[PDB]
Structure formats: C-alpha cells, structure tokens
Design a protein around this ligand. Sequence first.
Ligand code: C5P
Ligand code: C5P
Ligand code: C5P
Ligand code: MG
Ligand code: MG
Ligand code: MG
Ligand code: MG
Ligand code: MG
Ligand code: MG
Lengths: 150, 150, 150
Amino acid sequence: RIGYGEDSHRLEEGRPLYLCGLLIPSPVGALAHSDGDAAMHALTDALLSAYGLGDIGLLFPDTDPRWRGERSEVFLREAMRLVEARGAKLLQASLVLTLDRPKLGPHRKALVDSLSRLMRLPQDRIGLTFKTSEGLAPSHVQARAVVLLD
Amino acid sequence: RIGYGEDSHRLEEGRPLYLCGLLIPSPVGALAHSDGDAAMHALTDALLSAYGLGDIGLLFPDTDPRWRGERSEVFLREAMRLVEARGAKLLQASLVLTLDRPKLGPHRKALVDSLSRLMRLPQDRIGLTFKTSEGLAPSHVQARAVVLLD
Amino acid sequence: RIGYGEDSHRLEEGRPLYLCGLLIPSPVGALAHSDGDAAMHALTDALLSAYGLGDIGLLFPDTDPRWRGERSEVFLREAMRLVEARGAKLLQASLVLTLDRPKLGPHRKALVDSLSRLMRLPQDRIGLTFKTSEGLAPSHVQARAVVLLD
Ligand SMILES: Nc1ccn([C@@H]2O[C@H](COP(=O)(O)O)[C@@H](O)[C@H]2O)c(=O)n1
Ligand SMILES: Nc1ccn([C@@H]2O[C@H](COP(=O)(O)O)[C@@H](O)[C@H]2O)c(=O)n1
Ligand SMILES: Nc1ccn([C@@H]2O[C@H](COP(=O)(O)O)[C@@H](O)[C@H]2O)c(=O)n1
Ligand SMILES: [Mg+2]
Ligand SMILES: [Mg+2]
Ligand SMILES: [Mg+2]
Ligand SMILES: [Mg+2]
Ligand SMILES: [Mg+2]
Ligand SMILES: [Mg+2]
C-alpha cells in the first residue's frame, strides 16, 4: 500500500517552529491553531490515506478534548495505531520540506533521528529532503510525503 | 507500477465546482475550457504516467471531437481502458485536494464513493485527503495523486 | 523502495532552459548557480531519498570542487551509483513538470528518450507529464518526482 499526504502553514517571526517532532531554532514559526508541524501532519495524512481512513481534520478535530493543545506526534501515533490494527507494516516514509528559512541542513541528523524513532523505521527508510521555495512561498512551510506499507 | 499526477485550475466565483466526478455546491468553480475537475485530471495523468503513455493534454485534446466538452470522467475511464489493455490491475489511488473553500468534509463519503465506483476500487484503497492552501493559493484548486498498480 | 523529490527554479528571460538533461529552446530559463534543471534535481533527490542518503545540497554542494559547475546529469548518475552500491535496482520514475512556457509537448519524445537513456529504464517506465501553473507560478519551473526501486 501507498499513501500520499501534504501540509502547509503560514510562518510568523517570533513563533516556535516545530518540524519532524522537533522544536527548531528559527526567526519564524507556524501561525496555526496547532503546533503547525507540517512534516508530521503530511506523514499522518499519508498514513491515514493508505487505508482510506480520512484525514487529520476528520480524525483530530480540536472539538475533541483528546486532540486539543496536543503535540502533532500524538496524531501520528494514533494513525500508526489505526493502520497497524488493520494489518499494516510501515516500511518507508519519503518526504520533502519546503521553506526558505531557517536552513534545516544543520539539523539533518536530529530531524531524521526523530522520524526514525517516531515511525520505528531504520534510518535508511526515512527519506527526508529540504528545499527553499525560490521565492514562491517565503512565508510558509510546506511538506509533501509518501509512505509505503507492507 | 507507480504513477504520479497533478492538476490545478483557477477558481472563479459563480461557476460550477466539479470534484471527483461530482457537482459540489460552492461559491466558486473552475475557470477552464474543461469542467476543471482537478481530482479527475490528476488521477488520469497518474494512470497514464504509470505506463509512460503521455498526459491528458496529449491524449485528450479538445481539438479532438470525441473529447471536446466531455466530462472528465470520460478521460479517466479511457486512461483506465488503456492501462488495462496493457495488463494493468489498479490497486490503489491516494490524492490530496488543496482548496480554501468550500469545505469538502460534508461531501467526503460521496466523493470517496464516486472514486471507488469509477476506478472499481474498494473504499480502503481510495485515499482522499483535503487541505486548504493557508492563504498560498486562495483562487485555485490543486490536486496531486499517486496510483499503484499490479 | 520508494522515494519522493521536488525542485523549483525561478525563470528569467534570456537564460538557457535545461530540462531532463536537454537544452530546450525558450524565452526563459533558470536563474541559478546550477543549470537549474528541475527535472534532474527532483529525480536525484528522489533517488537519494529512497535510501535516506540526504539531498542534493548535502551531497553536491557548489562548495565542493568536484561538483561545482557540473551538469545536473552528473549528480543523477552519482545518485544512481550510490543506491546501486546499496543493492538497488531502479524500476520506474514518474514526474510532473510545471511551467507556463515554453510548451514542452513538441519536445516530449526527446525528453523521455533522455530520461530513458540516463536512468537505463524502458520508455514505459518513464512517466513524464507536463502542466502549466494556471497563473499560480508564472515565473518558475517546478518538478515533483516519485521513483520506485527493486
Ligand atoms: N476544502 C477543504 C479544506 C480542508 N478540509 C478539512 O479541513 C482540515 C484542515 O485543513 P487545514 O489544515 O488546511 O486548515 C483538513 O484536514 C480537511 O479535513 C475540508 O474539509 N475542506
Ligand atoms: N509547459 C507545458 C505545459 C503544458 N503542456 C501540455 O499542455 C496541457 C494542458 O496543460 P494545463 O492543463 O496546465 O493547461 C498538458 O496536459 C500538457 O499536455 C505542455 O506541452 N507544455
Ligand atoms: N530550509 C532549507 C532549504 C534548503 N536546504 C538545503 O539547501 C539546498 C538547496 O536548496 P534550493 O535548491 O531550494 O536552494 C538543498 O538541496 C537543501 O540541502 C536546507 O538545508 N534548508
Ligand atoms: Mg494543514
Ligand atoms: Mg498542519
Ligand atoms: Mg491542467
Ligand atoms: Mg485540469
Ligand atoms: Mg532546488
Ligand atoms: Mg534545482
């Protein structure tokens, strides 16, 4: 099975930036009702999508207390619980983060380490790449992810 | 086999919105020579791509009488005919629709039912997720699709 | 294994346009320190991503004299060397190029022929599709690519 997911958030100077489950030193951060971690949302949607389960807005509406104020790893782990319950064995996650600043290369090892631990995948099965927007979206972070299961 | 496809259309107020084969009640809709069904087009391109057959512009030009003014499901069905003639067995489709409004959640079941009927896939093999553009693309609909075959 | 990669480049009038390894006659071309071949870059990042090896800015930075000023096919061939040494067999590449002008349809045969020759894949395993940005990104070329291996 395969699943494809996307996320994006506007970025504001002076707000914390969460990506891949980590808080990143940065002059900008997501301006969103949640932690705005585009990487974990895209991955969560891709996982849900691989089983036709819906999307993060459907399964994690802030309307439910279980979801209100929570770090995005809560949503990812719930999506893994759901697909695992359906027989899935996650094999790979490959995703692209688009953002102009900050540079994520200095944080590559920690970002991949975090995804590896969160999704319980070997490091060679975490495919993380970074790009700028070349001016197309200078005030947003964007993430697009594919997952492979079985 | 895998295939990857994308489509996008300018939205304009007061035009009909078509997604996944259905009319969706909406304040806005595609500004196009097509019905502008971004989901249908992205899936068609994904299917063609999986066999290297070209893209919707090549295969379904409106300079072609069989395809001019036709609904986009006609093109999806012809793309399925072509890949099935080459021995394909579609397994799964996962796609993301990006649009600010209207909300697609209230139409989720009908949209997934439509793709399941049209591609003859079980509901758990239709992975449909929705997102807004968080202000990045307020006047467009975008779709990106992955298909898996054999 | 699967990998997903993206690239984009600003377009400017009177610069040469490189796509899939080829010069494309065009009013506009990449503004870049590289040849700005978005197709090559997205495919390279997708291959690297499939083994968790990093991205083109990590492996092929222009701070490294070995890679500065090289054509983008050089990087793609080295990515192919790296995954092959890890046991990979590339099976398929599917990618989408987004750009308003020039029209790529007249170049379709040559582009596909080039990717087939470069990746050593049969034409039915090169899935190339083209789209405009519909006004969303009129001064950029964008590429998004999925690869499948083993
Ligand atoms: N056009 C849209 C856009 C988003 N949505 C739901 O809204 C949610 C939140 O989307 P954002 O994260 O883009 O705000 C989604 O996860 C999707 O459930 C929708 O139902 N219709
Ligand atoms: N630069 C481009 C962009 C699109 N095209 C062809 O133009 C078609 C229509 O694209 P739009 O749907 O973006 O208008 C495609 O499906 C592709 O055949 C092209 O040949 N060169
Ligand atoms: N936010 C970002 C954006 C890009 N990068 C690195 O910068 C490189 C070049 O990115 P551009 O091609 O978008 O300029 C990448 O291939 C990635 O290594 C980064 O480390 N952090
Ligand atoms: Mg979102
Ligand atoms: Mg989000
Ligand atoms: Mg189109
Ligand atoms: Mg279209
Ligand atoms: Mg780049
Ligand atoms: Mg590039």
